[PDB]
Symmetry: none
Subunit: 234 residues, 4 copies
């Protein structure tokens, strides 16, 4: 099988090459990643061949001056056909409400919109730096699980820094309490700090709960934002 | 009731004041919208980072509205608005200059503001008008905006709804989001300087299904889609 | 004469339409301004990269003006405007919502548009009004915009002038750019999450001198500063070098 | 002497470390460069210690989440006292009309406004990648020359890939002709190409002419944009 790997952090992210190397154990890997979330149609996108270092395996790759979605569209053109799109590993979590604004997820979603199977991978920072040598086994195990899934699939994966297990999860959906704290800069000019916080703790079985417990979290995602329970409201 | 009106096109957009005016027919309106000149980046609330906002006079040829121009995101305007004008019962975002249908809902800044209000435990709605070429006439659309708001306010609260109004509506329907597969058209090119680039023109594969938002607007109908916050595909969870 | 009016605040700014209406008393006016919702960008003309621009209906409560909303920089608006509405004799940029005085001129997008017109061999002027405290009253400023424009149109061409109008003008003055030395005040701080950051509060070492743009506006006067394109320090082209 | 080195290309640019190493032969060097042009006051600025590139001398360094000017204000705070601000070496020329809005120049200018001496450095691109090892002798000769100037100074420097000389220069100031090429994308949607071009050849003595001749160009800059030939008296009574 052929796999396109991309991300949101850019072509120099260690997380990108960790995912690429892990994916190469399963098929031919090609990389298209941003130079620095929808497909760009307003203007054309530039892309440049990106070289592999002395110490690394070679992967045909391009640095793309576009969005993660642009990388997917372009990658499918420059390397097509592709069977799977992998986005990440993002340096930062993509849990619960965060999934909406995620460029990592946007790339995976784009692949799915194109009819392919896709997955996004992210790791929360929490003070220390991710050890991709230690995470590698978990990337491989997660990929084994994903690749046995009925196709096509769209899955959001978050791996804690030091995982102890794997759990299929649902997105955490909590209500938030708005918190605004007025302030003044050294020149006396007013400004505001926003500090919204969730109302309750993450429910057991959710993605946020899973990673806090030390488990890799995998959430299958839907494209349909329709709330079908309210199509014929009272 | 008390209504907060915001958008993602900016404090000077005619669509913003058109929505505010229509909303004033249903309650007290307060406005908080993004300021001019600030790189459009992200739809989340700006956290633990100072955000600037200033009182702003409402348009002369419009009713008076307390208002602030916010140097932040549409979600920031909602967070700030609930604070400056609390308590708020409803958050309306728009009317966006450009449609927000099907897969576009995911990345809409207009929708993000409404979603933020819903996350804060309030009812909310986003409004968008598809303007491809021809120009939107808010005076002509006022009756339909009023009728749409009337209908939304009959819903059980809280609700989260995405509304798209064609330029000249001839009906109203509740709709589901269109979900089509796309084709990733990429056409190589070269600029006048002889440099290589690519045109991306992704195209949907089939026509919009009957009953969807994209189908409804194509019919000339106002489309109202109730939205969910949960992106989990429960059919794939054991 | 044909006048191209643009700004950097966007096609919906009341300052843009106030400037277009004032200019219409002196010639044919055409508008080309930045569209809303744009990624941060510089002030140069976008080269070897296609730019989108669309016919735009001028506002209901403003006389009619042919117009285009351009998805590019203020300089792009000028380049596109000279093409769509050519020939153009004058480029007017503003009225900017916020002042552009002294050192601020270097980085003004409003000024960048006027300068682009001048680089193209045309006459140009940038217009700005101080903000932060209360927006401007363009109806009350109209007599001053007109007065200012009549003065500029008497100048030998081509010219490049930077104009700042106080909220309530009590006169007019040709001024020079205020050029003060600064102190780079940096004050450490921490956000509600305990993370560190720095407040940068640069401050001028002295009060603005009489005769400068900053001093004039503070006195209630409309300020007009003629600008040079050449940044060469002409007194150091043959510098004395130490032993 | 103490030197703050910054740029606008970011902390990863080889041009920045080339300037830092050359400058270290004249004094102690500290680096503050953008993470990705005036000082930011509307909000704060975040900055983080950053390692200098492996296989290169070590320099105290911070990557700043702000503008080139922010780096200067932050650098003066983190590494004060500072005697000289050097910005570059920018990958891309900063000649003639380009000076006005160059981020590289903006940093040097900020340093000058703060009362220090400052200089911006740039190298032209297209085709060949700058060879900083080969450029080092010319960077050193240029810095040695600037350090002989009466202070404070503000100079804009452009170095050809393979210099064969050095010249003080005037800023090129040519008029441009607008060129707009209408077009349509593959979907038949209209767009516009902009290709403005200078009207004549650069004059002798200017920065653009000097670099075209293979010489390092050094232009002293003036901060006062006032055109005194057009200043006027008031028409009062
Ligand atoms: Mn990321
Ligand atoms: Mn919008
Ligand atoms: Mn402005
Ligand atoms: Mn640069």
């Amino acid at each position: 099988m052929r796999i396109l790997v991309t991300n949101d952090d850019g072509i120099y992210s260690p997380g990108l090459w960790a995912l690429a190397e892990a994916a190469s154990q399963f098929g031919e890997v090609f990389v298209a990643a941003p130079d620095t979330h929808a497909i760009t149609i307003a203007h054309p996108v530039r892309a440049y061949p990106h070289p592999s270092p002395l110490h690394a395996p070679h992967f045909p790759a391009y640095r793309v001056r576009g969005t993660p979605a642009d990388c997917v569209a372009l990658g499918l053109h420059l390397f097509g056909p592709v069977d799977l799109v992998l986005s990440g590993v993002n340096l930062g979590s993509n849990l619960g409400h965060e999934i909406w604004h995620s460029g990592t997820v946007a790339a995976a979603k784009q692949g799915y919109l194109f009819g392919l199977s896709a997955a996004a991978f992210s790791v929360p920072l929490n003070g220390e730096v991710p050890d991709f040598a230690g995470l590698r086994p978990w990337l491989l195990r997660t990929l084994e699980t994903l690749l046995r899934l009925e196709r096509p699939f769209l899955v959001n994966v978050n791996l804690p820094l030091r995982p102890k297990g794997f759990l299929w999860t649902r997105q955490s959906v909590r209500a938030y309490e708005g918190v605004v704290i007025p302030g003044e800069d050294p020149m006396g000019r007013p400004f505001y700090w926003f500090a919204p916080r969730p109302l309750k703790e993450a429910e057991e079985g959710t993605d946020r709960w899973a990673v806090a417990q030390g488990f890799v979290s995998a959430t299958p995602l839907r494209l349909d934002l329709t709330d079908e329970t309210r199509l014929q409201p009272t």
